[PDB]
Amino acid sequence: PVVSDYEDCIRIDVNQETNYVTFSFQGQKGVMPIWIIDGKNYSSSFNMTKYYRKAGDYSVEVKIANSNGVSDRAITRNFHIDKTIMTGFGGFDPESNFNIWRTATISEPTFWYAPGWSQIADPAYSLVNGTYTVTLPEATSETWQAQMPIKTNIATDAGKNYDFSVILTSTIDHPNVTVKLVDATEDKIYYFEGKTPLVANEPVCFWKSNMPGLDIANLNLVFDFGGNAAGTVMTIESIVLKDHANDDGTIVPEQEETPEPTWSAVDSEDNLWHSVTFTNEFYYAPGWNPIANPALNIDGATYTLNFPTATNEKWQNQVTFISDALTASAEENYDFRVILNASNDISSATIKLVQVGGGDNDNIFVFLLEDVKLTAGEDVTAKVINAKGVDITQAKLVFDFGGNPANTEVIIKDIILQKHKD
Template identity: 40%
Template sequence: MKKSNIIFRSSVMAGAILMFSACSQESVFQPSMAGLPKASDYKIGIAVDELNNVELNILDANGNNAKGVYPIWYVNGSTRPSTSLTYRDLITIAGDYPVEMKVGNANGVSEGTVNGTIHIANTIFDFTPYMKALTDNSSKEWSVDGTKDGNIGCGPDGSNPTGWWNGGPGAKEAEGLYENILTFGDNGGESSGTYTFNPGASGTIYVNKGVNSLPGLEVNNPNDDNDFRVTVGEVQTTFTLSPEGANLYLVLPANTPFPYVPTEAAFANPRYRIANFSKSEITLVQECEGIAWQYIIAPRAEDTSFKGFKYDSEFNMWKNANISLASTWFSPGDWSGGLEPDLLEVANDKITLHTPAAMGNDQWQGQVHIETDIEVSAAETYDFSCYIDSPVDSKVTVKVQQIGDDNVLFEGTAAQQPFESGGSCYYFSDLPGFDGVMKIAFDFGGYPDTDFVVSGIVFKKHSDDDGTVLPTPGEEEPEAPVSWVDVNSDDNIFHGCTYENTYYYAPGWAQIDNPELVEEANSWTLTLPEATTDQWQAQFAFNSDMTTSADKNYDFRVTFNSNQDLPGVTFKCVSSEDDNIFYMADRVVVEAYDEVTYKWVNLPGIDIEKMNIVLDFGGNPAGTKVTVKDIIVQEHRD
């Protein structure tokens, strides 16, 4: 969340202000009572999702995001305001909760207020969706999300936990905060499970400068008025989701590590109020005496990089081959040779090397030649892979060739290949062989005084399938450029249209009563009590007067949220007169409790006098509650 903070730092700054005032009086902003915002010009935007997450925004009189002002929120009778531009919370108990909003700008704060009500339809009794989101019904790794604004912060209280300091992306990278791994596991408990804290590569947690003792840990506070790191090992314990009043807490046992420890009392009683909850992001607020801390955690990114063919496969000829170190040649930049590596160990499963510090920077100035007894045939094609790890990004040559003739090799392998720090894979597939015995000439030239580990070497016939799925070549296509209008803007064609909702709800193709519909601002929630099996058995349509033209291009956007996994949701923008004239009729996946937005960008226009939006949830489980919201249809904007 972005915050507006006005901080007077020192008398030096005050003097600077006075000095500038004397030099250029007309440039100094003078607050004016006449410039105060009028509360009556603004509205409160209130959104509540299926998990009882609440989001409040300040809107102008037209329902668009307000500009040039900031809100002051008083939620549910709180006497301590929040100035978050977007206020988020999670409320566990059904009911109506009052919201009062004042409006501020550079001139001051409005005298009047805007009032609203947060309506929570359901009390949280069933923790199934929360446990699923947290554990994936098995186990799931989370970390403090260093890419997010506000991933760590502090403020005066739980309603404004980043009011004093709001850590931006990477704010605590150097302190190892983002390397800690929090694993939440499902052990069959209704609202509890297993919790494993692993410090990750950092080996530490980060603690406040006022901490001097933590049970079970060695704390060496340098007393230099700075937060510091404490070494910690892996800890396996439990967690509980605990509703307390209208709040939901993540509770850990006493003295359980977490990436940041603000106080000794907080470590002794680790309780985190859940301010926002989804399968892809959780905001936690830790309330301490006189201060509150915020943390945003997110699932750790899954490593989908290709690791190579399967080393332990029966088809890997390298694994059981007789290999030997035939020779090495390391040279300074003058090509005089004569250098020896500081470390060189060769085995089938791993080759370990530390290059000489005086080695040159050119290719072929750091050679390691490994010979084998593997017979290669020109009548076959082959697959090869190896994984090279070093502390720096590097370019290494992996020349797979014939013993005795440097000019007989697998195509392309004499070139330097890029490897990432931390490890990456080089491979080739289905390349023609040669008649002879194989060797590998590695070259590490250009990277003096550097550690390298080569592992996972696989050499096999291409016809021997070890089950490896090769990565798809090329990069993912970038998202098409588009500028989205506000959902409440007059430029949103859907916002300005008139429509009538129609239904076709027919489990087993036998139509039954229409599903219950709850319509709120830009949001439509359907309850589907019975399961369907086929596409088009659970239709919901907006029959509208929207018009599109063939001489323009259009963008479409829609957001879904559901309490059940929906394997195929159809979104079809279609002529009211002909079902065969439409922009799209795609089936998209909506996972339970995961708000997902789909977009169709820069589609060529079609002459349609009246365009309907037809949605279908066919294949839904019984008891599905699905929300469709924030529909935008606009003329294309780059």
């Protein structure tokens, strides 16, 4: 069987939208094809499809067989995949009506491009159907030397929870691209400041799920490409911000439960909470009517509170431990543990480590632990493992016991706060 005969019988078909290559053959009685792709014999079909995820030049070696057997010579046919398609999580649905970004007034991006911390002309950018292309001719060394702030009119509320994703691509390997969703008026108040490396032409989804709500009148979304190689071309697409309450049908991957760390003892120098000469104010108001400050007994590492009157819902029985010059930083990841004993069943208990002041200050916090089911008599543990830190000047520890029965005794025992142990 002379392979050269059946040359215009063989037909390649590349779908550039899906990155599937269709190998087909116009039937010539008993003459059928053999597909050897990248030195792998995939038998004989009239219509066969293979996924070519990555971009590049690819070659199939095709032979001809019949009753006699397989031919000696093979035909090499070459094809190109224009654009690499993403691997891993694809992020939230950018076309969903739950995407607050589609409703919002979005500013043109601004820039602060400064190799050696010496500012040069803004990089050329393109906005094509919501997609940013940004070209960086000059290399930068540090984070914050290639800033792209995007100002929005997006407001959010405390007591709601939020999801975020964006898809980032770089034409050149990038050590760390920064993404920061921040209060336009206060750089200290932000949902996250995270970083992701990028491999050349490999789209990555940077994403968060169930972020505790902050009272913010105007969000900025700030990108930094600091540390870029010269000639780097950044692509930014599929920006999503939605309420966690609303489900767009996204299969959010399960973050494998954070392993427990080395718990330093209550007395040690790793206690941070030990040596805090603290203070107490209370918001104890059943039906939102404030009565007298309840009974508190400090016995070392054990604090005992007696609630004679009942409450119905969140933020009605608040106990504030005001630290005199306790601090935290965003450069650290913290651990936190406390043993809570309630004499009666208490549904929804809340702990929050937060800046001392009122107003904006209670949007600056290390953790907000909610929905802690404190069972009657059981000495339950309220734990926060490897929480990202935040810059606090004068920290305070806020407890809430909303929905408590009458004559409920709460014992706060062995509060511990440390750096990450593991």
